[PDB]
Each structure stands twice: as structure tokens, then as C-alpha cells.
Amino acid sequence: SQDYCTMLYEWLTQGILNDPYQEFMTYDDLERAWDTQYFIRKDVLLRDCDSEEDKNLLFKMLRTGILLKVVRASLQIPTIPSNSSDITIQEINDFADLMEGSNLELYVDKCYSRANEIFLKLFFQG
Amino acid sequence: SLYYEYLMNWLTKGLLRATYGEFFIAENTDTNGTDDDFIYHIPIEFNQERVPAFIPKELAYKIFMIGKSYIFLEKYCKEVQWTN
């Protein structure tokens, strides 16, 4: 799961979707090009998305990635500098631990806080 | 050693995962229409007849209460960061 952790970390901290093998939870359509629609591959999800907290976590991940991609596309930059927020995210170096319990919920919560901070900074100032 | 793993799971995560009825704390989602959604219940029972003879009933109640309080804080008080 190391490469999957890499993809998830990228989607959670920079909104980048490098998914050449159709694996990640979500993906952009449309391969002018800004009215993008996201989908969610239900089959490849990590949590079954049946209860309410699992759906909350899933959509928090999706929204974190979406907001970070928006921020990154507006500034015409290829990546968001790590100093753009005081909430810094570490890499996922143990997938089993991350999926143990509420660990994934806190990880996605930190990523969502950083994403919302940067997105609101960008909109309300730039 | 594996019973200690049971206890460790219950005391640090509120988990009754794969105990097969060997633990003195069983998840009890069996209700009779009263609190179908566990607004008042925390559906977990504590059988005093299953406490092993090498655990004092006081420490067994303390274990039950530690697990119940962890599940409480994490699910109803939404205290996720502190519980983690």
C-alpha cells in the first residue's frame, strides 16, 4: 500500500491525480476545460461507504482534493508550497496504522483544515 | 497473551473485534424498541459471570467503564483528537 498512500497523500495535500491504472477513489473526467466533473469509483474504496461517518470521511477526502486542485489551478502553479499554511501534513508511512481506527479520520481532518484555510485565503484575498 | 490483546483492544479502542464470546464485555445491539438508535443506551453489556478469576470485579468494572467512556467520548462527544 505504499504507492496507494503516495497517491492519497498527493490528492490530500496538492489535489494532484496521477492515476494511470484507474485505481484511486476518484478521478477527473475530460481527460475551456474547467467545468470538470469528478467521479468516485465505488469498487476501489477503502471504506464501504454505508454508514454516516464513512460517507462524511469519503466526501471530506473528495472535497479536500477538489479545493486543493482549485487553489492550484487558479494560481497557474503546478504545486502548492508547503509554507502556504501553518497546518502541515506528514506523509502516510504506515497504511495499516492509518486504517487502524480514527487515525484516517484525523488525517483527513488535518488535510481538510489545511485545504479550507488555503482556499478561503485565496478567495477572500486574491 | 491473546486475552491481554483482547483487554488491550477494549481499553485503548473500545473494540470487541473477534472475541467470539470469550470476553466479559459483549456488544449488545439487542433492543426491544426502546432506543433503537442508541440515543440513551451505548449498546454494550457487562456480564459479571464471565469475569475471569484472575481479574478483580472492581478492576473488571473499571475496564468496562474505561471502554464505555472511550466509546462515549469518541462517538457521542465527537472528541476524536483527544480519544486518538
Curated annotation (Swiss-Prot), chain A:
Compartments in which it is found: Nucleus; Cytoplasm, Cytoskeleton, Microtubule organizing center, Spindle pole body
Family according to the record: Belongs to the TUBGCP family.
Assembly and oligomerization: Interacts with TUB4, SPC72 and SPC98.
Protein's job: Involved in microtubule organization by the microtubule organizing center, the spindle pole body (SPB). Probably part of the microtubule attachment site at the SPB.
Additional record remark: Present with 2230 molecules/cell in log phase SD medium.
Name by which UniProt lists this protein: Spindle pole body component SPC97
Organism: Saccharomyces cerevisiae (strain ATCC 204508 / S288c) (Baker's yeast)
Lineage: Eukaryota, Fungi, Dikarya, Ascomycota, Saccharomycotina
Portion of the full sequence shown: 276 to 412 of 823
Swiss-Prot record, chain B:
Localization, UniProt: Nucleus; Cytoplasm, Cytoskeleton, Microtubule organizing center, Spindle pole body
Domain of life, source organism: Eukaryota
Family recorded in the similarity comment: Belongs to the TUBGCP family.
Note: Present with 56 molecules/cell in log phase SD medium.
Subunit structure: Interacts with TUB4, SPC72 and SPC97.
Function text: Involved in microtubule organization by the microtubule organizing center, the spindle pole body (SPB). Probably part of the microtubule attachment site at the SPB.
Name by which UniProt lists this protein: Spindle pole body component SPC98
